[PDB]
Amino acid sequence: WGYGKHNGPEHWHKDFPIAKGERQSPVDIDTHTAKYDPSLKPLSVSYDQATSLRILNNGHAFNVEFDDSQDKAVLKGGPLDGTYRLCQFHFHWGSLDGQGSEHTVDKKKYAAELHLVHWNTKYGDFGKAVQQPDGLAVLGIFLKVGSAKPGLQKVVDVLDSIKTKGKSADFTNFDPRGLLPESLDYWTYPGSLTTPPLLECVTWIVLKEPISVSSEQVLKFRKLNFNGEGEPEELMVDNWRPAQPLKNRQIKASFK
Ligand SMILES: [Zn+2]
Numbered sequence: 001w002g003y004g005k006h007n008g009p010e011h012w013h014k015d016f017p018i019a020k021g022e023r024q025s026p027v028d029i030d031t032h033t034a035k036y037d038p039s040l041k042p043l044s045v046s047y048d049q050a051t052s053l054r055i056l057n058n059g060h061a062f063n064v065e066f067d068d069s070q071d072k073a074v075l076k077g078g079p080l081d082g083t084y085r086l087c088q089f090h091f092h093w094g095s096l097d098g099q100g101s102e103h104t105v106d107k108k109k110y111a112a113e114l115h116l117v118h119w120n121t122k123y124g125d126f127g128k129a130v131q132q133p134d135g136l137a138v139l140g141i142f143l144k145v146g147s148a149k150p151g152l153q154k155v156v157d158v159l160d161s162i163k164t165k166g167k168s169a170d171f172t173n174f175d176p177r178g179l180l181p182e183s184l185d186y187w188t189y190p191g192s193l194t195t196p197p198l199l200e201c202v203t204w205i206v207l208k209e210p211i212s213v214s215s216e217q218v219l220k221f222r223k224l225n226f227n228g229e230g231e232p233e234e235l236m237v238d239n240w241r242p243a244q245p246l247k248n249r250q251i252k253a254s255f256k
Contacts, residue, residue, distance in 0.1 A: 001196045002060065002226065009241045016198045023200040024244035025191030026102035026140075027251070034187055034251040042254070043184040043205060044077035045139070045177075050086065052174035055158055059165035059226055060195065061090040061239055064155070064174060068119070068126075073176065075118045075137050078205055079188040079252065084118030084137040087126050089176060091115070092194075093221045095237035097145050100218075102194050102240045103206050105142075110210055111218050112143035113240070114179060115194075133190070135201040141181065142210035149213045151178015156220045164229045181209035189251045194241045208255060 001007055001015065013019035050073035055064045066073055066086045073086035093112040094100030101110035116139040119129040129135030154174055161169045185208035192200045224236035 003239050012196055012198065016196045018192070018198050018200060021192070021198075021200055022247050023190050023192055023249060024198065025194050025202060025204060026104075026241060026243055027189065027191065027246050027249075028104045028107055028243040029187050029206065029251055031106055034253050036256045037252040037254070040079060040186075040188070040252055040254045041077050043075070043186060045075055045180065045184065046071075047073045047086070047175065047177045049073065050176050052171050052176075054168050055155070055162060055171040056168035057162045057165055057224060057236075061092065061236070062159065062162060062224065063088040063090045064171055064176075071121070075116070075139060075205075078186060078254075080137055080203060082134065083121045085121060086116060086118050086176070089114060089116045089179070091143070091221065092240040093143075093218060093237065094240065095222070097215075097218065099238070100240055101142055102243075103140055103142075103204075104243050110142040111145050112213070112221065114141040114143065114211070115139070116141070116176065116179075130193075130199050130201045132201060134203060136193075137203045137205060140204060140206040141179065142207070143213050143218065144210045145215055145218060146212035147214065148217055149179070149211050151175070152211075152213055152217055156217045159220050159224060163223065164225045164227060164231075166228055179211065181207060181211050183207070183209040185209065185253075185255045187251050187253050189246075189249050191249075208253075
């Protein structure tokens with residue numbers, strides 16, 4: 001599977017038939033049909049103790065991986081009834097600034113989208129968690145182009161070293177607090193992973209406020225490769241799945 005004409009999102013259902021299921025992600029957030037829920041609690045993001053390990057080009061994005069052996073980087077509160085440990089974060093982006101996000105807002109696309117991926121500590125480990133409808137919580141954050149995000153620069157600065165599929169670099173001492181906007185206002189709905197295996201295991205929490213990144217910062221994403229070293233160059237752009245049908249799920253918001 002991939003993001004090409006012959007292996008892209010419109011093909012995934014042939015190997016992963018849940019691609020046409022009832023709680024697929026991403027979705028468009030229609031701000032008129034999304035429901036303000038005053039009962040929605042503030043989100044608790046506790047990343048003070050977050051321990052980054054490595055950054056790697058897995059052939060469809062880059063992932064920063066964390067030590068999730070303890071409650072060092074946990075998401076709780078908001079719509080969640082449990083505690084969720086950060087395993088990895090990655091982004092999706094476009095071939096130009098006008099597209100790249102997975103979620104949309106009133107069908108508007110952003111230049112990129114950051115996903116911080118967390119698993120439910122009821123379930124022992126990540127691989128057990130994804131078998132459960134409440135196994136993961138993904139915090140999604142839109143990227144728009146403007147001022148530079150200082151907290152992203154260490155990520156931008158290492159990407160030249162992981163250009164091709166299978167490359168990795170040590171990536172210690174990275175603090176993901178540097179990737180958060182000021183507000184934790186959010187939309188939330190039940191959904192899925194946005195890549196195969198497309199499991200319907202995710203509580204999605206999508207922040208209202210985008211982070212601003214510079215032109216130069218998002219451009220660096222577009223120099224990565226889907227291919228391995230020595231193989232014909234396939235630039236890693238447009239690694240986003242389009243919005244999928246909401247199918248009567250309720251998107252709730254912490255604001256009107
Ligand atoms: Zn993602």
